[PDB]
């Protein structure tokens, strides 16, 4: 996102507001045709492209409304404040720093980090349904799961992996108990 | 759901993994812990685009 | 499949450490464990 520290509202604010947000979803739910696309945002110059070098000389605020406006449940994770003011960009969504395999992990920020790595490893060899045309592919050693199931504890990103359409496991009912010593 | 990105060779799917390399036409400065007379080396791998 | 198409490779300072700059460009979690650790990253 592109932060405009200049604003008549007396403080920094994004170049993106409800209007485009309204317009964006309008394009999606068409399925009259207008197709207000992502590129239109770049054409409007509301979101910028940044590489590693460009990151050297910017000041990225974490969550837009968390920090951009100026200035309690303890179970909420403790965060830093927006003492700084001269921002230039705000993260679109912090959860997007993960990869493809990582994103499937529910509540990864509640895990010991190497565990995340292990899941990302195994998740590659998770028996499931790899393609919907498996009946015509003559590949070697294909594996299909009898009754797949969408996970109950999904992730916002997971919808963008088509995971809900091609799940890779089942929601088993699990009881944690030293029951029979087996 | 299949999204391409891979070539088919003699009936086998193949994928070109992205490769990593140092930047071209960029200057870099290195020290030298070795007792070699060259304390600092300002290496640069130049290249024509 | 998706992860594979977004995989990076790196032939052999220390590259295995997750570098600060890797933020939000390569996955801080997905990396094969063992001889490839750190050397193989994913966007």
């Amino acid at each position: 996102f592109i932060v405009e520290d200049d604003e008549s509202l007396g403080h920094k604010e994004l170049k993106v507001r409800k209007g485009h947000i309204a317009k964006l979803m309008a394009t999606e739910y068409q399925d009259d045709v207008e197709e207000y696309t992502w590129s239109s945002l770049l054409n409007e110059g509301l979101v910028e492209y940044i590489d590693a070098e460009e990151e050297e000389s910017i000041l990225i605020a974490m969550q837009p409304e968390d920090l951009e406006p100026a200035e309690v449940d303890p179970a909420k994770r403790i965060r830093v404040s927006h003492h700084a003011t001269t921002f230039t960009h705000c993260e679109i969504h912090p959860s997007m720093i993960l990869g493809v395999a990582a994103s499937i992990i529910p509540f990864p920020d509640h895990n010991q980090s190497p565990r995340n790595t292990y899941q990302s490893a195994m998740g590659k060899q998770a028996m499931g349904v790899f393609l919907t045309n498996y009946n015509v592919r003559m590949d070697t050693m294909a594996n299909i799961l009898y009754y797949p199931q969408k996970p109950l504890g999904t992730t916002r990103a997971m919808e963008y992996l088509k995971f809900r359409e091609l799940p890779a496991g089942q929601n088993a009912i699990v009881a944690i108990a030293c029951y029979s010593g087996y | 759901f299949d999204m391409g990105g891979y070539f088919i060779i003699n009936g086998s799917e193949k994928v070109l993994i992205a490769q990593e390399r140092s930047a071209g036409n960029i200057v870099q400065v290195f020290k030298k812990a070795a007792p070699s007379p060259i304390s600092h080396v300002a290496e640069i791998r130049s290249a024509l685009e | 499949t998706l992860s594979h198409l977004r995989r990076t490779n790196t032939p052999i300072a220390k590259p295995r450490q997750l570098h600060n700059t890797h933020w939000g460009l390569v996955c801080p979690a997905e990396t094969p464990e063992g001889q490839a650790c750190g050397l193989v990253k994913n966007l």
């Binding site: 507001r17 992502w38 969550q63 | - | -």
Partner: peptide
Amino acid sequence: DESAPITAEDSWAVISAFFREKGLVSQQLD
């Protein structure tokens, strides 16, 4: 209203637009 600043939740629509325009394997194709 349409001039008001956005909340965090709205970003997913942007992300949904982002994937709609690009897709996951853009760079391979690009």
